[PDB]
């Protein structure tokens, strides 16, 4: 049926230091309006499965 | 850059009667624990990019 539980990230404002772990799950802003934790138009959802 | 803006249902409890659209954006329960509204395991949103 496909599993779904993997994912990664796919958004962030800058790149990573070597062996930095980011687990922060938040509203990633990709346009010039607040997304106020609503995923929608031009607010996306960093991690992907 | 990957235009994002673009998503399709992935997830209902079963097909659609013909000439029927849906908008109910709420999580998808794919096991035998709810999820109360907050994607992890087993638990996913039910639209997809």
């Known amino acids: ?3 779904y539980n993997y994912r990664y990230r796919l ?3 800058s790149n990573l ?3 930095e772990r980011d ?3 938040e509203i990633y802003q ?3 309006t607040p997304c106020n934790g609503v995923q929608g138009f031009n607010c996306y959802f ?3 499965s």
Do not use: V, Y
Request: no cysteine; net charge positive.
């Open 30 to 32: 990709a346009g010039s």
């Open 46 to 48: 960093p991690l992907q």
């Open 23 to 25: 687990i922060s799950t």
């Open 1 to 3: 049926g496909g599993n």
């Open 11 to 13: 958004f962030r404002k």
């Open 17 to 19: 230091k070597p062996f």
